[PDB]
Design a binder for these strands. Sequence first.
RNA 1: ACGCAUAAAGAUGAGACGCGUUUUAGAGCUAGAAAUAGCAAGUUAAAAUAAGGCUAGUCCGUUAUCAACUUGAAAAAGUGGCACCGAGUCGGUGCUU
DNA 2: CGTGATTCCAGCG
DNA 3: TCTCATCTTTATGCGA
DNA 4: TATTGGAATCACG
Length: 1345
Amino acid sequence: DKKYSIGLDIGTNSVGWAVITDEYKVPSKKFKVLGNTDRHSIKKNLIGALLFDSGETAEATRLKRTARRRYTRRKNRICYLQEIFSNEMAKVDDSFFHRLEESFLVEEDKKHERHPIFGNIVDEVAYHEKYPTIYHLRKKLVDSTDKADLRLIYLALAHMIKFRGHFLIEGDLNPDNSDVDKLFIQLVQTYNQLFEENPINASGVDAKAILSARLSKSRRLENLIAQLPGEKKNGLFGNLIALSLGLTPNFKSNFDLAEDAKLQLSKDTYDDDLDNLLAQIGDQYADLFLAAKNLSDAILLSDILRVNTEITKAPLSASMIKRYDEHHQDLTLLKALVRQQLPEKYKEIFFDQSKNGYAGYIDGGASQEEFYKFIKPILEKMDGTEELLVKLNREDLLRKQRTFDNGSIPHQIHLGELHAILRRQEDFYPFLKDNREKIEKILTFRIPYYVGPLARGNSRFAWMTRKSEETITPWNFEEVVDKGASAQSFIERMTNFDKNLPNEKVLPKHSLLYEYFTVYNELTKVKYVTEGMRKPAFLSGEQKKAIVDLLFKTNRKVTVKQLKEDYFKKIECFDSVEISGVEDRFNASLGTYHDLLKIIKDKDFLDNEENEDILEDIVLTLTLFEDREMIEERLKTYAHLFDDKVMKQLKRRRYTGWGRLSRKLINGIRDKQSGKTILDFLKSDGFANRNFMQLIHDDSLTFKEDIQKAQVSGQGDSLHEHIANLAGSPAIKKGILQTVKVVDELVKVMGRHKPENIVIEMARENQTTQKGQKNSRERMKRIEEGIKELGSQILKEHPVENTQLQNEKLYLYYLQNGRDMYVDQELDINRLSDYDVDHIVPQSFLKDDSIDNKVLTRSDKNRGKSDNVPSEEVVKKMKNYWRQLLNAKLITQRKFDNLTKAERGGLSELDKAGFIKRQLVETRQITKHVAQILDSRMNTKYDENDKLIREVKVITLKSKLVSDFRKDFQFYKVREINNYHHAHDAYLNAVVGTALIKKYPKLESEFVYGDYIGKATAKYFFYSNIMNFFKTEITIRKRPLIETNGETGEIVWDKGRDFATVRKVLSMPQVNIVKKTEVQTGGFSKESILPKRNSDKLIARKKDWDPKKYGGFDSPTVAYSVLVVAKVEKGKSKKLKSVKELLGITIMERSSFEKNPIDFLEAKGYKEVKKDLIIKLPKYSLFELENGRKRMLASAGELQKGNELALPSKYVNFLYLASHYEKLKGSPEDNEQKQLFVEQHKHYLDEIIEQISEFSKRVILADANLDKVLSAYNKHRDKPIREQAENIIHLFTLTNLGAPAAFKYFDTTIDRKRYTSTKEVLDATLIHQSITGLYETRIDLSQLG
RNA sequence: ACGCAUAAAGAUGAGACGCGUUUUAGAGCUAGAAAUAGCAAGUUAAAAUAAGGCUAGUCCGUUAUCAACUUGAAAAAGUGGCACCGAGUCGGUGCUU
DNA sequence: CGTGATTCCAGCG
DNA sequence: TCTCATCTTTATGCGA
DNA sequence: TATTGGAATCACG
Ligand SMILES: [Mg+2]
Ligand SMILES: [Mg+2]
Ligand SMILES: [Mg+2]
Ligand SMILES: [Mg+2]
């Protein structure tokens, strides 16, 4: 019958809980201990923390699942090709495909000859000599005309199909449009054919070198214009050249068409704009544009390949052959030079695989970059290596055909090569002639992103709808899959429902109705004051309509200046007026109205409200679909209203994004006694002038009743089901469920009585208006100021709008002044999606995708950077540019440090020593959901008028309040001492929340969940000053010792005892720390495929691949260990010996074991096991052995420390002060006093060490490490107090709970002492802990046997 | 608690690239009895890329769930007095059952 | 000849 | 690494 | 608001 409160400190990887009473005292209770041990009752305090492994996001699972799908579909492509070829291959060589399938097997396991292709040694050797690589074969098949062996044709086609390339570029890059000079000559001839007055003569100009140079587009244009005698860059030929290279030219000046008619070949609107231009003049110039298109295709081909393609139809194969030949020549030259000049290193370079030489480059794991790093000093220290050095600096020395940078090759190249092979060989083999389209489709077919997995209802990820029930081959995908329905479901399965009407779907963000709702909602709360008016008055419905018609429907954005002058000064004839409710510009805007008015050029069509449904359907279609086919098909129904050009313009426009409200809410429902929708009320509410929130929360209005009727959907769900149904990442579910479970356990412990208050520490914050606005400035402002300070002209070259900067690649392009950050080059603005957003710190090392860890760079450069920080060479080359950007504030100091990390060593392990920025977001949303769940679950009873009775007030305390409470009353928190700080944080949150809701009841609306100089500054100052009643001496002001309730008589705070009570609570030794036992799930083992070795720790990669001959995985992950007491066979006679041991069922064996434990154990060797004496021990199972020493089971063969060091609060405060945590943030008097306190308490350090020492003599039992730490401490006694305190904070890692870790005390480094022996725990006391740790069951394992 | 505008950090799903690794194939030669030594060669390909499963799909297989005990196919339900004095991981005293 | 100390490693753009 | 899409939390600013 | 287990190798009483 004693009232109590529960304080919670939630985190991503920890949940601290505390129970307090009226006097802020944590109760102590006797809990019964179940089990067979003699211990039966234990006294425990109602405070503690729950520790669990962080909930992982589904990112890795999704990536692996997508990889699995891609592998399955690649094998299916190869299977389709084999099915096509099988009929003729059986005539040629029946077992060829069988040999290809079984090539992996060892000689004896093979059912055929070991040679896969030809089946005999001589032919295989001859083939390998004639075609050293596959690319030689591809080049030969493309170029040769004689009949080729069908096996070679299949090999080439299978190589092309298996590795087809990227699909980033749309359309078809005709390989025959390869020559640049010939197409340029054709363009010149076509230009001169109709323009004989001033013919263009470009003879003797090396067009290929000039246009296909590595310089920038503008530089190449200028070079070509200069080489053109008497031609103009802005001329018609100049504009055609600019279009061909990539620049978007203005054709208005060339023909004086009075319209710009800008033509960018990259844009898909190029064709329609060209049709417009033809309508301006005629089709006589069309051949010129066709020649320009061909020249552009040739230029792009040369850029992506950079090879002489004038003699072959397979430019990629020719490039690879040239690369192979140059590799061979350079290798021979390097061998000769090493033999002549540095013979003793020859064996190191060409034989030692362990090194990074050529032997390590080919046979070893050394990459191209590492090989260049190793070989450059040797190359420079020699003679006759000029060409080798030039190649090395160009990254074209001893290259491989299959490298990292092949990812920039479009699939059109392989498509053209495959088409050439088929055309060459179709006459000899008729089945190639009649199956050309089949194989080309196999190469080019790719499931649309909106269709997803092609399941038959057995997949939780599939959404496609099948028109006909049939197997989906790539050749009938168009006839079996309902693409329109699939795309509609793809969009709709992700978009959320309206909160007020959960059955309805939200409107598109750019929908006309949504924009009208936003504009009217913002406008209806505007007050105007003119001379002669006593008070501000709301805008009337007539005035609001006039404003909308005059200002919003004409100007894209309406500023207060226009409203004050265009309307009030002119229409209303008001000389002066003051406007309140809008700061500078109306946030809402009729953007869609202006876009559609420009598209259709019909004011009356949009103004009329009869066709409002038509516009809503138009915007819905433009939002749902992106493919022009589906959009055109949907808009066909409305084609009669508009015209053909208007229809094409509508097709071009594509909105994206969805709003937060439905159409049934904005304009669907109506008031019973008014017959006006919410939008109708917003347009003209009369003198009341209510807005949306007042409308749906008005009792006189009937909208609230309808919302209540529609919101009865959610009832009768279990807690697990409720958590699972929550939208968001599955990472936060673990934390939310654990918090709710510990709250329920605490309620159960206190005799089923609900807590009076539940105070939760929440990551909210309050900032001053200046700081808040300066961190919320639009990125356009940042890039504008950076460009202005940098002195660049990129903004004038390519003007941008703040909306367009939402695209990450464009934003990074502008942030980097348009130039690459890893090489001294210039990025192409139009041709994005060829560069990569590289994480400066590799994504495999640390999870950080902030703007301070992203750089837009060349794809090949990024991929060569690989799993590393940018190399020292890149840092040296680009440090000046990085500093220039840093001075212009285009990049932050953190980004500069990330870029120049290579100078300060490499990726040290300590770099992974800070909190991830993802953890803060996870904590925020975990706390939000926890508050919602607790408020909904605790308060269930409703009043007579259906009003919830707040029996359990949920308070959301901001972390700053508790942090200041700690920093003001010497309750300092040191995170490294132990895990008690979570429980202490929870207790302090409870205390502060209870005190604040006691002394200041009027603050309940601001702290209790439910009801609720700029405003931010006012709230910041208010929150800072609220906690002043805790202070004894303000600033000097001495408030009374015992704080009164205020307007009532209560003891809200008593500084004489309450501080003492809190100090006593924070120094309690017994705090219930629980490590949640988790069954390990995830990958079966390490993904690395180890080579063949005679070891039984290897796991076979297939059931028929014995690891003694094929290698395989190792290091399996143990799902949970199993305590088994049984009999094993010992000796040759195999006598039965009784043994008790842990087995460690791995993840891969978990299903087999759980299906039949006895048979599995007997297979493992143990005999006469007991199905009842088998004990399932998950990871982190707790065993108490002796002297209170606790070990947590980490696996079948390793233990973790399971004890917490209860350091007294005085030592913790001394460590916090001496270490200068957060430097010194006190007044000079207080800083001097604290420094004197530290100096007078030097001896504490010794005592602190003693503590740790004695702890390590009782629990840790690490003799060598403890002796090393003592020796280091004795060595560093003469150091200053600050360094010693910091290094002792480091030293506390020895006695922390969890897996042992290695630490550093000054210079000395102490490695981790691992307890790789689980023999002891077999004769210890296993402890099953409830989620709060209060309820325990102790099992004496020594009694088992 | 919510709607807009701006921003920062994140999340979820789909379609695709490029590598990497494993085993085999690409007859290594000579001197050697061998141990080995000298020389030549090196760039490519096939297959696998969680074992695997039944629902046989161009599907699914690494997120989420999980203290012990009792009842249960599961879902889920149930199981553990209090007060006070103290405190090195909780101990003691009284009451009560 | 088991056992404690030590070293090395971990699929990725 | 690329392409496409949809969500969340938090901060500031207007309005209840 | 955080954070290592598997495996091999070697000294050595
Ligand atoms: Mg916290
Ligand atoms: Mg498979
Ligand atoms: Mg990268
Ligand atoms: Mg905490």
